Design a protein around this motif. Structure first.
Motif, PDB file in Angstrom:
ATOM      1  N   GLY A  51      -4.034  12.215  16.006  1.00 30.33           N
ATOM      2  CA  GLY A  51      -3.531  12.409  14.647  1.00 30.33           C
ATOM      3  C   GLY A  51      -2.127  12.994  14.583  1.00 30.33           C
ATOM      4  O   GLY A  51      -1.729  13.758  15.459  1.00 30.33           O
ATOM      5  N   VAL A  53       0.502  14.797  11.249  1.00 29.16           N
ATOM      6  CA  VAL A  53       0.587  15.252   9.849  1.00 29.16           C
ATOM      7  C   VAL A  53       1.880  16.020   9.602  1.00 29.16           C
ATOM      8  O   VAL A  53       2.419  16.629  10.524  1.00 29.16           O
ATOM      9  CB  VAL A  53      -0.671  16.065   9.493  1.00 29.16           C
ATOM     10  N   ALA A  57       4.638  13.057  11.323  1.00 26.91           N
ATOM     11  CA  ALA A  57       4.040  11.761  11.063  1.00 26.91           C
ATOM     12  C   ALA A  57       5.091  10.672  10.824  1.00 26.91           C
ATOM     13  O   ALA A  57       4.743   9.499  10.864  1.00 26.91           O
ATOM     14  CB  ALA A  57       3.078  11.884   9.875  1.00 26.91           C
TER      15      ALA A  57
END
Length: 84
Positions: A51, A53, A57
RNA sequence: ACUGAAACGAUUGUUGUGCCCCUGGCGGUCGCUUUCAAUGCCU
């Protein structure tokens, strides 16, 4: 010291949005070095975070020593892929 | 962040409506159920 000649054969079609022109996006006929370095060594040497964020990102981390996904880790392992 | 992350050329659609294997045609033509025969014999 050591040098490896790698031949890359495509086993399904390869797409990169290298330039964009109306409805059509196109792949340049050379594989860029930094793309190949992460393709060879992400997970084995460079970290592979599933992931992302925040600004991380949308902002690359090619040569940022604070961020995890850096190609500078490879400088340290003493490896360098050229482009294709 | 691999010129990166996610990425359905998709939804609806009857090869369909009409159409006689039809029209004409003699199972026909020739052909003797024929041939021979004691209602007999004796009162």
């Amino acid at each position: 010291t050591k040098i490896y000649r790698c031949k890359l054969t495509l086993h399904d079609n390869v797409f990169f949005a290298s330039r964009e022109m109306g409805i059509l996006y196109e792949t340049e006929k050379y594989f860029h070095n930094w793309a190949l370095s992460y393709a060879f060594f992400k997970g084995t040497i460079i970290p592979h975070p599933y992931g992302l964020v925040g600004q991380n990102a949308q902002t690359p981390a090619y040569l940022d020593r604070d961020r995890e996904q850096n190609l500078l880790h490879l400088n340290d392992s003493g490896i360098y892929v050229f482009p294709a």
